[PDB]
Amino acid sequence: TFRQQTIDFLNDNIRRGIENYYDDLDFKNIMDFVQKKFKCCGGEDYRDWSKNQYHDCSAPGPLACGVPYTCCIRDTTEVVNTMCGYKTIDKERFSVQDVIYVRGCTNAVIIWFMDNLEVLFQ
Amino acid sequence: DIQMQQSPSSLSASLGDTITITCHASQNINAWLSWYQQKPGNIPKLLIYKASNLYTGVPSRFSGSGSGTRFTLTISSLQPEDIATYYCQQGQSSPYTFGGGTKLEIKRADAAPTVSIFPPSSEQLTSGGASVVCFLNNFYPKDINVKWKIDGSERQNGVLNSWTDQDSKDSTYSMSSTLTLTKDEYERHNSYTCEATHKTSTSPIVKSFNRNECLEVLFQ
Amino acid sequence: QVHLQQSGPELVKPGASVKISCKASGYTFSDYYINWVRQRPGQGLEWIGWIFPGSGNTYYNKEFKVKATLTVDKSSSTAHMFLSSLTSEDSAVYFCVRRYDYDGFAFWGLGTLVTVSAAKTTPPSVYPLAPGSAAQTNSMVTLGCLVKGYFPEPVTVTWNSGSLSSGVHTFPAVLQSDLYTLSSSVTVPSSTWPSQTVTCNVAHPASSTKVDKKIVPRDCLEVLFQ
């Protein structure tokens, strides 16, 4: 399986972290940094943030069916809007690809890890 | 919890004129809003998406804009084919909700019905019944009254009526009346008469045939 | 070529259940949402709920959560809506829609008409409507067809297999003694009739019965002969 079992591993670990996103400083900051760096969000796509109890699309509060602000296009001269990701999951990618990163983080992280291995050895 | 309200419950205005519909939201929905058009006897088509932009294939005379709570869809140089019912929805927060529905009627010139009357066919008479059909096509305005007379006496029982809304092109309404009897009660009588009133001409419009109408022409 | 084909119209006794199926084509099925919208016969559009195939997540309107359940079968590239505990109100048309790459609902299904009724499938009877001996110089003549005794709606009606478009009036049927009856007319120039024939085509999907009725000028001698 090689790559495929790797995708399974990564998706499983980041879904687990998302489900406990607000209990883990380590994972919280890890996910925040990864998303802000690779301009990505989640596993297969940003929809994964729906499995967090606060961001589920049938949740009561306003964090429902939205995505944490680290998935917005942070590389702008603008200041941080915490609510930039709200109410974006029920809508299909191209509506919000101007507002948030839509690709998942698994694939982007793995393609970077591959193409930047020439320096990793020696 | 986000309910939509459309302002013109029923709005009719004349051709070439500019009309406007309002769609008010209960809560701020920023720019997440859509307008659709439903021609009568048809499935809905998408008209406007995201408040401002027009969906591909929509004629440029349609425009829409507004802010969060209140939105407007405006039609300039109104055309007859735009006779339809128009709806708006929001999409910011699920569950998505629709608008009350606004009916659009054209205001046109006084036409008059082109009435035609039809005797029951032999195919229907074989099945034991007889229905005399009466068509009133391409008439404006919508208000009209149709009644049936069997041998000079008005029958008010057994009549079945159907009304259409303004046709997309020509801007005129049309109506149909069927009168169904048993062949027993059909061929026991002779002259069947269909009468109509529609304001335009004070003398009402009446058509008929006698079951011996055939005998007149041939003198068989 | 983005298209959505739904199920054929359905008839169910009160309290039963229906499975509407919606097959999609032209796009990657798993990437885009599918919304369902119900229109009761004399009202506007009403929003059932949404479902995303790639994850299987579902959201319902509160009213229909009890009565409906949404599913997908990725291999079929099809979505399904299952309605249960149907009420006399639930008789309505149901659409499945896929939205545009931007927010609007771009692609609508044709509609599946679900009639909650005890009454049984009754095929129609089609009778021609041609005039007798009467005033013929009124520019164009008019002919028609009557479709009586059909259940349940709908009936697809065409004229000359689609040749006659202008001046064709198809009136919406009305329910009588728990039976439906419908009529349609066409106005064509007098010179064409009866040189160029006029035929009406009636399709009833429930009875699977499509009948072509030719309109004939009344033969006055057949009236005396009959």
Other beta carbons within 10 Å of B42: 11
Structure tokens at B55: 């969906």
Same domain, yes or no: C45 and C9: yes
Q: Rounded to an integer, what distance in angstroms lies between the CA atom of residue B46 and that of residue B70? A: 20
Taking alpha carbons only, the member of B141, B111, B136 closest to residue B195 is B136
Q: Rounded to an integer, what distance in angstroms lies between the CA atom of residue A31 and that of residue A25? A: 10
Resolution in A: 3.6
In the listed set C116, C148, C171, which residue is the last one of a domain according to the structure?
C116
Structure tokens at C123: 């095929």
**Residue B30, φ and ψ in degrees, nearest 5:** 45, -115
What is chain A's Cα-based Rg?
15
Other beta carbons within 10 Å of C7: 19
**Residue A71, φ and ψ in degrees, nearest 5:** -95, -10
CB contact under 8 A, C103 and A91: yes
Q: Rounded to an integer, what distance in angstroms lies between the CA atom of residue A9 and that of residue A16? A: 11
The reply to whether C199 touches chain B by the CB within 8 Å rule is no
Same domain, yes or no: C100 and C78: yes
Find residues 6-45 of chain B whose CB sits inside 8 Å of chain C.
Answer: 32-34, 36, 41, 43-45
**Quick one: CA torsion of B148, B154, B157, B158, rounded to 10 degrees?**
-30
Q: Rounded to an integer, what distance in angstroms lies between the CA atom of residue B7 and that of residue B12? A: 13
In the listed set C50, C81, C116, which residue is the last one of a domain according to the structure?
C116
Same domain, yes or no: C18 and C97: yes
Give the residue from A50, A65, A90, A98 with the most B CB atoms within 10 Å of its CB, the best one to mutate. A90
* CATH code of the domain covering residue C81: 2.60.40.10
Task: Give domain limits for chain B.
Answer: 4-107, 114-218
Same domain, yes or no: C29 and C80: yes
Taking alpha carbons only, the member of B41, B98, B25 closest to residue C37 is B98
Place of tokens 């041609």: C130
Q: Rounded to an integer, what distance in angstroms lies between the CA atom of residue A48 and that of residue A104? A: 8
Q: Which CATH architecture fits B114-218?
A: Sandwich (2.60)
The reply to whether C103 touches chain B by the CB within 8 Å rule is yes
> What is the 3-class SS of chain C, one letter each residue?
CCEEEECCCEEECCCCCEEEEEEEECCCHHHCCEEEEEECCCCCCEEEEEECCCCCCEEECHHHCCCEEEEEECCCCEEEEEECCCCCCCCEEEEEEECCCCCCCCEECCCEEEEECCCCCECCEEEEECCCCCCCCCCEEEEEEEEEEEECCCCEEEEHHHCCCCCEEEEEEEECCCCEEEEEEEEEEHHHCCCCCCEEEEEECCCCEEEEEECCCCCHHHHHHC
The reply to whether A83 touches chain B by the CB within 8 Å rule is no
What is chain C's Cα-based Rg?
22
CA angle C139, C140, C142 (to 5 degrees): 140
Other beta carbons within 10 Å of B169: 11
Listed in sequence order, the residues at least 6 apart from A13 whose beta carbon sits closer than 8 Å to its beta carbon are: none
Closest residue to C144, CB basis, from B53, B101, B118: B118
C-alpha distances (whole Å) from C102 to each of A98, B34, B39 are: 11, 10, 23
Q: For residue B207, list chain C residues with Cβ-Cβ distance below 8 A.
A: 134
Between strands B10-14 and B102-107, the pairing is parallel
Place of tokens 């009719």: B12
Q: Identity (one letter) of the amino acid at B84?
A: A
* A30 falls within a domain: yes
Q: Rounded to an integer, what distance in angstroms lies between the CA atom of residue B79 and that of residue B140? A: 17
What is chain B's Cα-based Rg?
24
CB contact under 8 A, C132 and B94: no
Same domain, yes or no: C108 and C152: no
Place of tokens 């068989």: B220
CB contact under 8 A, B41 and C105: no
Whether residue A55 contacts residue A64, with contact meaning beta carbons closer than 8 Å, is answered with yes
Q: Identity (one letter) of the amino acid at B29?
A: I
Same domain, yes or no: C18 and C60: yes
Which residues of chain B form beta strands (DSSP E)? Answer: 4-6, 10-14, 19-25, 33-38, 45-49, 53-54, 62-67, 70-75, 85-90, 102-107, 114-118, 129-139, 145-150, 153-155, 159-163, 173-182, 191-197, 205-210
Whether residue C171 contacts residue C182, with contact meaning beta carbons closer than 8 Å, is answered with yes
C-alpha distances (whole Å) from C39 to each of B49, B164, C36 are: 21, 19, 10
The reply to whether C43 touches chain B by the CB within 8 Å rule is yes
Element spanning B123, H or E: helix B122-126
In the listed set C91, C116, C141, which residue is the last one of a domain according to the structure?
C116
Q: Identity (one letter) of the amino acid at C164?
A: L
CA angle B116, B120, B121 (to 5 degrees): 110
Give the total number of structural domains in chain C: 2
Q: What is the DSSP string of A31-82?
A: HHHHHHHHT--SSSBGGGGGGSTTT-TT-SSTTTT---GGGB---SSS---T
Q: What is the largest CA-CA distance in chain B?
A: 79
**How remote is the C-alpha of B167 from its chain's centroid?**
7
CA angle C107, A97, B60 (to 5 degrees): 50
CB contact under 8 A, C54 and A94: no
Q: Rounded to an integer, what distance in angstroms lies between the CA atom of residue B138 and that of residue B29? A: 43
Whether residue C219 contacts residue B217, with contact meaning beta carbons closer than 8 Å, is answered with no
Q: What is the sign of the dihedral through the CA atoms of B98, A68, A92 and A4?
A: negative
* A35 falls within a domain: yes
For C140, name the nearest residue in chain B, comparing CA atoms only: B114
Q: Rounded to an integer, what distance in angstroms lies between the CA atom of residue B5 and that of residue C139? A: 47
Whether residue A64 contacts residue A57, with contact meaning beta carbons closer than 8 Å, is answered with yes
Q: What is the sign of the dihedral through the CA atoms of A86, A89, A93 and A94?
A: negative
Q: Identity (one letter) of the amino acid at B35?
A: W
Its domain, for residue C33, covers 3-116
Q: Cis ω on the peptide bond leading into residue C217 (within 30° of 0)?
A: no
Q: Rounded to an integer, what distance in angstroms lies between the CA atom of residue B194 and that of residue C220? A: 22
- What CATH number does the domain located at B4-107 have? 2.60.40.10
Place of tokens 């659409």: C95
Same domain, yes or no: C91 and C146: no
Whether residue B55 contacts residue B83, with contact meaning beta carbons closer than 8 Å, is answered with no
How close are the terminal C-alpha atoms of chain B, in Å? 75
Q: Helices A25-38 and A105-115 sit at what angle, rounded to 10 degrees?
A: 70
* CATH code of the domain covering residue A47: 1.10.1450.10
CB contact under 8 A, B96 and C128: no
Q: Rounded to an integer, what distance in angstroms lies between the CA atom of residue B159 and that of residue B180? A: 7
* A50 falls within a domain: yes
Q: Rounded to an integer, what distance in angstroms lies between the CA atom of residue B60 and that of residue B214? A: 56
Whether residue B146 contacts residue B177, with contact meaning beta carbons closer than 8 Å, is answered with yes
Listed in sequence order, the residues at least 6 apart from C222 whose beta carbon sits closer than 8 Å to its beta carbon are: B122
C-alpha distances (whole Å) from C33 to each of B21, B87, C30, C59, C65 are: 29, 21, 8, 11, 18
Helix (H, G, I), strand (E, B) or coil at B124: helix
Same domain, yes or no: C34 and C135: no
CB contact under 8 A, B98 and C45: yes
Structure tokens at C102: 């931007």
